[PDB]
Amino acid sequence: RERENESQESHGKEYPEHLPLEVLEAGIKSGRYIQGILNVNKHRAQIEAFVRLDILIH
RNA sequence: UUUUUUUUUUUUUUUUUUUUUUUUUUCUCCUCUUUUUUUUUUUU
Numbered sequence: 139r140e141r142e143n144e145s146q147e148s149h150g151k152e153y154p155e156h157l158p159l160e161v162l163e164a165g166i167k168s169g170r171y172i173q174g175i176l177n178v179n180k181h182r183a184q185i186e187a188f189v190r191l192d193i194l195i196h
Numbered sequence: 197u198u199u200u201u202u203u204u205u206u207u208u209u210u211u212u213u214u215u216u217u218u219u220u221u222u223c224u225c226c227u228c229u230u231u232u233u234u235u236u237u238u239u240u
Contacts, residue, residue, distance in 0.1 A: 177233080179231085179232095179233080180233090181228095181229060181230080181231070182229080183227080184226090184227085188233090
């Protein structure tokens with residue numbers, strides 16, 4: 139009963155689609171985008187992703 | 197004492213040509229464990 143709900147609440151997209159650069163210059167300048175290096179744990183390597191300014195990416 | 201006649205190896209040579217490696221499939225796919233991540237230092 140779960141199965142149909144998870145498979146029909148997934149549609150036809152797997153990852154957020156990217157977008158142009160002029161957006162990213164502006165979003166930096168206006169001050170709504172930080173940017174740093176990104177590393178991952180290695181005991182847990184599908185969950186514990188870090189965004190060196192640390193931002194936890196789950 | 198036994199004469200005379202019954203052809204034979206197809207004829208021919210003095211014709212133009214402006215393309216080009218290959219060639220045509222097989223789907224989506226659960227990476228298990230003390231961690232933040234350690235870090236100067238000196239002898240190559």
